[PDB]
């Protein structure tokens, strides 16, 4: 066999230990999920520093007057939310964020509402998105890409144990904190589902073929997306791209991918097993589950526990200015709370 008794027993015990962590993690999640927290701050607790983004609402850098600590506050206009048919998405996203707990998931620190708006007060990550670092550097070396990939593998293993499908993996949704580690943001398309689901959602370059083909699909779409992400991090561009989304979908369902000549054989083997159209052969979807991914040769040097514990030295630390340096400043359009409670019943649960 590939490993003798010492290696095989240590691996077995580590895998059993993961099961024990997940079982406890699921119990903590379900309590918060069945009994969500509400109204844990108010607007006048914060000073609006800078509008960091602007459809359904804006995201503003704010400063807690009491704490002094900075936060990223998502302001959602309740009427705009209702008019654009986003009630369930917004409720679900906040309910997931308040219930999950994992070191690579951006944290909801406060939530509340007033007559006009819904507010989600998140951890502020001044390093910004992986997207811009990746486009700036060009591509990440395989060890650098692997350090990020390991965190996503663990995060998906966590999320899938809770029957959550993430469905919007991409560098735009991965923030880099001040220790160089990944924070996943934007659970707007995440769904708690045990079996199949059918919604056409995601980003074109990251869509699994079974989504494109109008099939019912499951959590295996996140493992396909992991493959696109690893490819893009190590190549500098995604495996499937074209002028128009339709031509991207053609390449995705074709079952063909080409790799740069600088990809190691270990990497190409992993990516062929993730970017696998056949669901009965896609890593993450087989009898051994996530272990086929964790035990793959490309991850041989990965110390999964040390990554989870954040003991591994990051390959890259964004310039520690919090400064809005890594964000394109917008017109600070003020926030006004109507004298009348708008859309009370629709957002009772928020």
């Amino acid at each position: 066999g590939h490993m003798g008794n010492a290696a095989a027993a240590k691996k077995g015990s580590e895998q059993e230990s993961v099961k024990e962590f997940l079982a406890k993690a699921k119990e903590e999640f379900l309590k918060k999920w069945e009994s969500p927290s509400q109204n844990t701050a108010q607007l006048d607790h914060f000073d609006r520093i800078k509008t960091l983004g602007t459809s359904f609402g804006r995201v503003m850098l704010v400063k807690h007057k009491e704490t002094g600590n900075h936060y990223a506050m998502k302001i959602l206009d309740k009427q705009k939310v209702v008019k654009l048919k986003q009630i369930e998405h917004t409720l679900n996203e906040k309910r997931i964020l308040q219930a999950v707990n994992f070191p690579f998931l951006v944290k909801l620190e406060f939530s509340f509402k007033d007559n006009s708006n819904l507010y989600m007060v998140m951890e502020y990550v001044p390093g910004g998105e992986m997207f811009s670092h990746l486009r700036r550097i060009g591509r990440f070396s395989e060890p650098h890409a692997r350090f990020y990939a390991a965190q996503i593998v663990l995060t998906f293993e966590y999320l899938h144990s809770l029957d959550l499908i993430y469905r919007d993996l991409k560098p735009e949704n991965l923030l880099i904190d001040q220790q160089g580690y990944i924070q996943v943001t934007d659970f707007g398309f995440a769904k708690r589902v045990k079996g199949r689901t059918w919604t056409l959602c995601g980003t074109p370059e990251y869509l699994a073929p079974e989504i494109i083909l109008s099939k019912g699909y499951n959590k295996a779409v996140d493992w396909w997306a992991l493959g696109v992400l690893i490819y893009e991090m190590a190549a500098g561009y995604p495996p499937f791209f074209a002028d128009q989304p339709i031509q991207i979908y053609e390449k995705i369902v074709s079952g063909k991918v080409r790799f740069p000549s600088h990809f190691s054989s270990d990497l190409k083997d992993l990516l062929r097993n993730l970017l696998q159209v056949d669901l009965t052969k896609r890593f993450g979807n087989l009898k051994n589950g996530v272990n086929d991914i964790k035990n793959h040769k490309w991850f041989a040097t990965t110390d999964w526990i040390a990554i989870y514990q954040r003991k591994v030295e990051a390959p890259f630390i964004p310039k520690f200015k919090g400064d809005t340096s890594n964000f394109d400043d917008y017109e600070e359009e003020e926030i006004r709370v109507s004298i009348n409670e708008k859309c009370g019943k629709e957002f009772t649960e928020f």
Binding site: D168, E172, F189, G202, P204, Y237, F241, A242, D243
Partner: peptide
């Protein structure tokens, strides 16, 4: 090159969902 093709795609910027 593939890289040039990526540039030619017009999809080098931040990509929206849906």
């Amino acid at each position: 090159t593939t890289y040039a093709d990526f540039i030619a795609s017009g999809r080098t910027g931040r990509r929206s969902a849906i």
